[PDB]
């Protein structure tokens, strides 16, 4: 089944969601050519721990050694911060954050383009965010998650890109990952009708090339099989009576926090 968050739990989710979003707004100025992903991770952890007085849900997760996941270019997800990995002009980088505050999780990620952007990098990032946005605009009571996944896939493929099938969005609350699973493509296995109070994430992973991926021998890093670029954006939301409310909205987002479908 699915969990319906109480008004009180939703407020706690707003707090946690805001903190997760603020980690991304905070790190922005540091995402420069020459900086190491290891350094970015330390900055994020110190901020989460010393200033937000929260905890990273990534640290120790199944043995994961870092506080955030940082994925560059062909890396699809779960990139491990490393002091030896330096960002450079043209890189597209995803920093994925999940913090726990007052028992609840806030989960969000965004793409950052390093220094001088490349046209293809900007396009992939733009389309990926647009696929997340179109999905968010569909969220409202009564709609099926399958319809949303199908819409994301149709949009992405029309642009000549592909959607990663191995990973998905998910319910969230006192648990990092809870039911339901939010696939970003059409699937006969998906039959979930939304209800007010449900909290979950939408986080499509889009490849510029083919959908196939590969996991590295370090046990964490996932890359595109064809080494093409891959991008991802993620937001945590709560379903409302006439639409949804984005809990991890940032100043740079260009979609309303509260989306309504009523007249
Ligand atoms: O956004 C998510 O749901 C998400 C990102 C990363 C994870 C789980 C994970 C896998 C491999 C290494 C570290 C982590 Cl936190 O879950
Ligand atoms: Mn995440
Ligand atoms: Mn997530
Ligand atoms: Na990438």
Swiss-Prot record:
Keyword Aminoacyl-tRNA synthetase: no
Binding site for a divalent metal cation 1: 96, 107, 234
Its biological purpose: Removes the N-terminal methionine from nascent proteins. The N-terminal methionine is often cleaved when the second residue in the primary sequence is small and uncharged (Met-Ala-, Cys, Gly, Pro, Ser, Thr, or Val). Requires deformylation of the N(alpha)-formylated initiator methionine before it can be hydrolyzed.
SUPFAM superfamilies to which the protein is assigned, alphabetical: Creatinase/aminopeptidase
InterPro entries documented for this protein: Creatinase/aminopeptidase-like, Pept_M24, Pept_M24_MAP, Pept_M24A_MAP1
GO cellular component: cytosol
Binding site for a divalent metal cation 2: 107, 170, 203, 234
Cofactor comment: Binds 2 divalent metal cations per subunit. Has a high-affinity and a low affinity metal-binding site. The true nature of the physiological cofactor is under debate. The enzyme is active with cobalt, zinc, manganese or divalent iron ions. Most likely, methionine aminopeptidases function as mononuclear Fe(2+)-metalloproteases under physiological conditions, and the catalytically relevant metal-binding site has been assigned to the histidine-containing high-affinity site. Binds 1 sodium ion per subunit. The sodium ion has a structural role.
Keyword Hydrolase appears in the UniProt entry: yes
Similarity comment text for this entry: Belongs to the peptidase M24A family. Methionine aminopeptidase type 1 subfamily.
Positions that bind substrate: 78, 98, 177
HAMAP family to which the protein is assigned, alphabetical: MetAP_1
Protein name: Methionine aminopeptidase
MF term (GO), any: ferrous iron binding
Catalytic activity: Release of N-terminal amino acids, preferentially methionine, from peptides and arylamides
Subunit structure: Monomer.
Impact noted for substituting residue 78 to A: Reduces activity 100000-fold for the Co(2+)-complexed enzyme, but only 2.6-fold for the Mn(2+)-complexed enzyme
Alphabetized UniProt keyword annotations: Aminopeptidase, Hydrolase, Metal-binding, Protease
Domain of life: Bacteria
E.C. designation(s): 3.4.11.18
Enzyme class: hydrolase
CC cofactor: Co(2+); Zn(2+); Mn(2+); Fe(2+)
GO terms, biological process: proteolysis
